Structures are given as structure tokens and as C-alpha cells.
Symmetry: none
Subunit: 189 residues, 2 copies
């Protein structure tokens, strides 16, 4: 699946970047950062309208994310370009908290499979196991997308949801092909 | 296999058909305690598994859909809590609940094993599964408890295998289960005696 690219501000019926969603207060800062991390660790920050995958520096330049966010996303981008080492390895080497490494791997798994920084390519879970990125247990966890940590506050319902839930709830924009997550100022629940 | 999806339902060998655990109990091919435990394994891992759709259900919805009966839903509350979390007194995970005597050791242990065998212990905080390393980090279990979970071969035989009627562990159940072709749902065979 494609990563969630941007936010759909239901109340204002318009697509906005995750950053704007945060600015508007309809996507909390943590959730927003995590959505952005999901982009960085899977190829790059997604321009909300062009769909172009961007490096953090270009994202900042294009106004897709601000400098502070760019800073906080460094580990996420490295989960893609390498720390080269992968997020799983960074967690092992005490460079990245488990929580972070786990979501990065889930972000990658849900979007095509774990990323192997060394080749930019994705790899099968069998290969990730072989590479030591994950063990069979982690593989079963990853494959069981229904049990992913509810690390996001659904911007619309305000309930805790996983990134798989987010993808499930996301809608695709008219052929930009971009996956949008609806957001509201207050819970729709 | 060391880990796998939770057993979802029963394959009634005599009738060559998949039925819910509840139905297995009803037809007397799965005893109520074993059936309850198979259901606990589902409840503590996210939800009662709908036998046909595979969707995870709250106990309430499972009762509403006839997937489990009212009395069973009552008996499954602790297992569901093993997933959603035990009221803080900051929700407690199953392991913590055992420590605070809120959950009998046996029930807690069953739940931890069910989770472990199906991907990893559940962190009620984020309602997701975590590596054992992380569970240790969170203080859910210490190395000793982690070692116990790892030795799946030594899990208590808490189930009566629906087919052989012999006592087996959940690990055994998963190893003796069959994956239903189209659905990917894990079934345990059951026969009458």
C-alpha cells in the first residue's frame, strides 16, 4: 500500500499537508509526526499535491514540513536511506527506541515490506529474518497487521488507531493517487 | 512452528465442516473449558474470532453474533482484559495483573502464552503486540518469566485436544491445527467419542 500522503480536513473540505493538519490543530503533533515518519521511512516525505517523494531538506524547502519537524524526522528518513544500517539494527545498537523502530518497520511492512537501506529496495519478511532485522516472532507480529500498536490518534474519530487502521480508513484522492486521512477539529465519535 | 495466528475455529471431522468453538462445545465435541480457553486465546489477542469472516470481535459483539453465548462472554472478561488492559490501579497488562493478584496466576499465564504464541505479548497501553525484549523493557515480565514463555515446549497442557481428547498446550494446538484453504483461518479438528 502507499503511505498516507496527506490530510483531508473534513470541516473545510480540503486536502492539506500533515504539517498543516498539525498547524490547524486537527492532527495532533505526535500523530502528525508519525504519519510523516511513515513517509520518510518508506521513500521520503510526500508532497501533499504533487505526490513527489522528498528528502527532509527538500521537504523543508518546499514547505511540506518545518525545520523542527525535519529534525525530529531524521531517524525516520534514515530508516530509509540508512543510519548503511536499518531501523531494526539501529534499535539493536541502541540508536533508536524500540517503539520507533517498531513503527518504522510496520510503516515499511504495510507499504511493500521492510526496507534494506543498503539497496533502497524492499525485502521479503523471510529475507528480513535472514538479515537479522526481525525474528520469526517479529515476523508473525508484522504479518498480523490487526495487532499493530494503536500509535496514532485518528484525526477524525480521535480514537487510537494503528497505521494499518489509518490505511484502512484512508481515502484515495482523485488520481493524485494520494492516500488521505480525514481529520476533524473534534471527535466524529 | 513457534508462532502463528490464534486458532480461529473448529473443524468438525464427523460433519466435515468448520464450526465456531462455541458450536463445538454445543455439539459436545469440544469441552467447555477447552473451548473457553480457545476463546480466551482470541479475546486476549484482540478479539473473539468470527469463524467465517475472521474479524476480531469484542465479547459483546461476539455474543450479539452468536459466536459465543452469554455465560461464556462472562467467563472471557479477564481474557479480554488481558488485551484491553486491567484498570490502571495506566492500564495493567496481564503479567502485571497477576502480580497485583487481580488475575489468578493460571489465567494470567494462559493469556501471556496465548499472546506469546501468536506474535508476542500485548501492551494494553497501545493495544499492540511487542517483542519479549520490549515486554522486559516495560517491566511486564523479567528474564525468568520471559524464559518460561520461550520454553513453549513446557507450557501446561491446558487444553483437551478436541480430536484425540488428550491434554495439550496451546502451542500443541497450533501445531495440530490446519489452515483453512481460502480464509487462512486456523482450525482445530474435533470429533465425538
Amino acid at each position: 500500500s502507499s503511505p498516507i500522503a496527506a490530510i483531508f480536513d473534513t470541516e473545510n473540505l480540503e486536502k492539506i499537508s500533515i504539517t498543516e493538519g498539525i498547524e490547524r490543530g486537527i492532527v495532533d503533533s505526535i500523530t502528525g509526526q508519525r504519519l510523516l515518519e511513515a513517509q520518510a521511512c518508506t521513500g521520503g516525505i510526500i508532497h501533499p499535491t504533487t505526490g513527489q517523494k522528498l528528502s527532509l531538506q527538500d521537504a523543508v524547502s518546499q514547505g511540506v514540513i518545518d525545520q523542527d519537524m525535519a529534525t525530529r524526522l531524521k531517524p525516520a528518513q534514515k530508516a530509509f536511506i540508512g543510519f548503511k544500517m536499518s531501523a531494526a539494527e539501529a534499535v539493536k545498537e541502541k540508536w533508536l527506541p524500540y517503539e520507533a523502530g517498531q513503527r518504522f518497520l510496520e510503516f515499511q511492512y504495510l507499504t511493500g515490506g521492510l526496507v534494506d537501506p543498503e539497496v533502497h529496495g524492499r525485502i521479503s519478511t523471510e529475507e528480513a529474518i535472514r538479515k537479522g532485522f526481525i525474528d520469526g516472532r517479529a515476523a508473525q507480529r508484522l504479518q498480523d497487521t490487526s495487532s499493530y500498536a494503536k500509535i496514532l490518534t485518528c484525526p477524525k474519530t480521535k480514537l487510537k488507531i494503528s497505521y494499518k487502521d489509518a490505511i484502512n480508513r484512508s481515502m484515495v484522492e482523485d488520481i493524485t493517487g494520494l492516500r488521505l486521512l480525514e481529520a476533524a477539529s473534534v471527535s466524529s465519535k
